[PDB]
Design an enzyme around this catalytic site. Sequence first.
Site, PDB file in Angstrom:
ATOM      1  N   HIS A   1     -40.976 -13.835 -35.963  1.00  0.00           N
ATOM      2  CA  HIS A   1     -40.655 -13.660 -37.486  1.00  0.00           C
ATOM      3  C   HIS A   1     -39.593 -13.331 -37.825  1.00  0.00           C
ATOM      4  CE1 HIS A   1     -45.153 -14.697 -37.809  1.00  0.00           C
ATOM      5  NE2 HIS A   1     -45.479 -13.576 -37.456  1.00  0.00           N
TER       6      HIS A   1
ATOM      7  N   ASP B   1     -49.031 -17.881 -30.540  1.00  0.00           N
ATOM      8  CA  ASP B   1     -49.596 -16.612 -31.344  1.00  0.00           C
ATOM      9  C   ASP B   1     -50.290 -17.378 -32.411  1.00  0.00           C
ATOM     10  OD1 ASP B   1     -49.100 -14.768 -34.028  1.00  0.00           O
ATOM     11  OD2 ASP B   1     -48.469 -13.514 -32.008  1.00  0.00           O
TER      12      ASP B   1
ATOM     13  N   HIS C   1     -50.306 -16.836 -35.614  1.00  0.00           N
ATOM     14  CA  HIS C   1     -49.323 -16.665 -36.802  1.00  0.00           C
ATOM     15  C   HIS C   1     -47.936 -17.734 -36.703  1.00  0.00           C
ATOM     16  CE1 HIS C   1     -51.187 -12.828 -37.249  1.00  0.00           C
ATOM     17  NE2 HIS C   1     -51.081 -12.911 -38.735  1.00  0.00           N
TER      18      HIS C   1
ATOM     19  N   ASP D   1     -53.568 -12.864 -30.532  1.00  0.00           N
ATOM     20  CA  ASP D   1     -54.294 -12.660 -31.854  1.00  0.00           C
ATOM     21  C   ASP D   1     -55.042 -13.915 -31.953  1.00  0.00           C
ATOM     22  OD1 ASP D   1     -51.804 -14.004 -32.262  1.00  0.00           O
ATOM     23  OD2 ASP D   1     -51.040 -12.469 -33.793  1.00  0.00           O
TER      24      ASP D   1
ATOM     25  N   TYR E   1     -53.893  -7.806 -31.305  1.00  0.00           N
ATOM     26  CA  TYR E   1     -54.303  -6.453 -31.841  1.00  0.00           C
ATOM     27  C   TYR E   1     -55.549  -5.942 -31.411  1.00  0.00           C
ATOM     28  CZ  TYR E   1     -50.110  -8.022 -34.149  1.00  0.00           C
ATOM     29  OH  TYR E   1     -48.868  -8.424 -34.303  1.00  0.00           O
TER      30      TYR E   1
HETATM   31  C1  LIG Z   1     -51.142  -7.188 -45.511  1.00  0.00           C
HETATM   32  C2  LIG Z   1     -51.257  -7.890 -44.425  1.00  0.00           C
HETATM   33  C3  LIG Z   1     -51.080  -9.647 -44.595  1.00  0.00           C
HETATM   34  C4  LIG Z   1     -50.254  -7.710 -42.997  1.00  0.00           C
HETATM   35  C5  LIG Z   1     -50.487  -8.718 -41.975  1.00  0.00           C
HETATM   36  O1  LIG Z   1     -51.683  -8.889 -41.422  1.00  0.00           O
HETATM   37  N1  LIG Z   1     -49.186  -8.790 -40.982  1.00  0.00           N
HETATM   38  C6  LIG Z   1     -49.016  -9.247 -39.970  1.00  0.00           C
HETATM   39  C7  LIG Z   1     -47.928  -9.938 -39.652  1.00  0.00           C
HETATM   40  C8  LIG Z   1     -47.650 -10.432 -38.381  1.00  0.00           C
HETATM   41  C9  LIG Z   1     -48.580 -10.492 -37.316  1.00  0.00           C
HETATM   42  C10 LIG Z   1     -48.268 -11.241 -36.155  1.00  0.00           C
HETATM   43  O2  LIG Z   1     -49.040 -10.989 -35.232  1.00  0.00           O
HETATM   44  N2  LIG Z   1     -47.550 -12.325 -35.904  1.00  0.00           N
HETATM   45  O3  LIG Z   1     -47.285 -12.708 -34.748  1.00  0.00           O
HETATM   46  C11 LIG Z   1     -49.626  -9.846 -37.745  1.00  0.00           C
HETATM   47  C12 LIG Z   1     -49.840  -9.331 -38.932  1.00  0.00           C
HETATM   48  C13 LIG Z   1     -50.508  -6.087 -42.672  1.00  0.00           C
HETATM   49  C14 LIG Z   1     -49.436  -5.167 -42.902  1.00  0.00           C
HETATM   50  C15 LIG Z   1     -49.788  -3.739 -42.249  1.00  0.00           C
HETATM   51  C16 LIG Z   1     -50.976  -3.479 -41.795  1.00  0.00           C
HETATM   52  C17 LIG Z   1     -51.943  -4.244 -41.574  1.00  0.00           C
HETATM   53  C18 LIG Z   1     -51.788  -5.583 -41.974  1.00  0.00           C
HETATM   54  K   LIG Z   2     -47.895 -19.600 -33.266  1.00  0.00           K
HETATM   55 ZN   LIG Z   3     -49.440 -13.068 -34.521  1.00  0.00          ZN
END
Ligand SMILES: CC(C)[C@H](C(=O)Nc1ccc(C(=O)NO)cc1)c1ccccc1
Ligand SMILES: [K+]
Ligand SMILES: [Zn+2]
Length: 359
Positions: free
Chosen positions: A136, A173, A175, A266, A306
Site C-alpha cells: 500500500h 493479499d 487487499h 489474509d 493477521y
Molecule cells: C479501520 C480499518 C479499516 C483498518 C484496517 O483494517 N486496515 C488495514 C489496512 C491494510 C491491511 C492489509 O493487510 N493490507 O495488505 C489490513 C488492514 C484498521 C486499522 C487499525 C486497526 C484495525 C483496523
Molecule cells: K491483492
Molecule cells: Zn492485506
Amino acid sequence: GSATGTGLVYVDAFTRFHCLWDASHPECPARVSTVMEMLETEGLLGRCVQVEARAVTEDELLLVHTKEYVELMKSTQNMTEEELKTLAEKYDSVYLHPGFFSSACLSVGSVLQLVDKVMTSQLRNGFSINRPPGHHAQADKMNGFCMFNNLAIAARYAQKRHRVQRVLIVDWDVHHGQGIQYIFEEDPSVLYFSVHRYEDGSFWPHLKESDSSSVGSGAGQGYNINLPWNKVGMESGDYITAFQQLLLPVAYEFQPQLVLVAAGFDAVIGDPKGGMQVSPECFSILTHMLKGVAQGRLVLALEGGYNLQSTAEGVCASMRSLLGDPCPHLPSSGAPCESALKSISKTISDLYPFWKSLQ
Ligand SMILES: CC(C)[C@H](C(=O)Nc1ccc(C(=O)NO)cc1)c1ccccc1
Ligand SMILES: [K+]
Ligand SMILES: [Zn+2]
Ligand SMILES: [K+]
C-alpha cells in the site's frame, strides 16, 4: 546453500516495533515470530538457505519514493510518541514507532537480497519473512500499515541492477495493492496482477481504481490487472480458477524474467479481516502455478495476514512448493462459485483487448 536452493530472510529487527496506542492492533510482531516458529517446527526452516538482510539505501528507496518523504520517514526515529501519533494520523490506516523506519529499511533490503541471489543463480527462489508490509505504500505517503513499497522497489531494483526487462508482480493479499498499481500504472515493463476483496467498494481501501476497469494507462495500458471479489467466503477453487483462466495465460504471453509475490495471507480461513475461506494448503498450489515462468525466479515477500496460525500455515504451504515438494491434494472442489466466475469473466472482458491469450 547454493543455486538449487530456497532462500529465507528473517531478522529480529522485524519484531522491534509495535503499535504504542492500540494493544490490539493486528499488525504486530507475533506475525513474523509465529511464522518462524512454525517453519522451524515443520522442519522447513532448516531446508532453506539463510540469507542475510540488509538495510535499503536512500538511492534504492528513491527508485520509488520521493526525497522529501524518505527524509520525513527517517526523522520518525527521533520523534516522541505524541509526534509519532500526530504524523501517523495524517495518513490512512497506519501507526508509527521509533523503530518502524529501521525495520522498514531492513524489510525492503530483505527482498533486494533475495533478488540478487535469485537473479545471479545463487538460489532458485526465496521468501522474505518481513514486516512492515509494503504493497500500500506510495511515492510520498504511508498507507495501510506500510511505509516503503518493498516489492515496487524490488522490481525497479531488478531492472536497474540486474537489467531485467519484464517483471511480473502477483498480489494475492486480500487487499488491493493500490500503491503498486499507482507506481507502475504507465509502465508496460512491470505487469501487476491483484486479486482482492472489493465488495463493490465496501471493503477497504474503498477505491474505484481497485475495480477491473483500471487496466493501466498510456504505454502501460493492459499491464494492470485487478480481480475484485464482490462476495465474502471465496475458497481455494476460486483462486485456482482465477490463476488458470486469467493469470497464467497472460503471464506466459508476458514472459516475465522475474516474478515477485505480494504474499499476504489474509485470504486464509480464520483471518480476522479478510473474510475469505482459502485453505492454507491452497498456497502450495498457487506458488507451484507461478514457478513455470521466469526460469522459476520467484521471490515472495510477506504482506498482510493477521491470524497468527493461519498466516504461519500459509507461509509453510508456500515454502513447501518453493522447496519442490509435491503439492498436496486439495479436498475442496476446484470448481469456482458463481460470484467468482462473474468477477473472472468481467476482468477477462476488461483485459481481452490487450492479451491474445484472452481472446
Ligand atoms: C479501520 C480499518 C479499516 C483498518 C484496517 O483494517 N486496515 C488495514 C489496512 C491494510 C491491511 C492489509 O493487510 N493490507 O495488505 C489490513 C488492514 C484498521 C486499522 C487499525 C486497526 C484495525 C483496523
Ligand atoms: K491483492
Ligand atoms: Zn492485506
Ligand atoms: K503496470
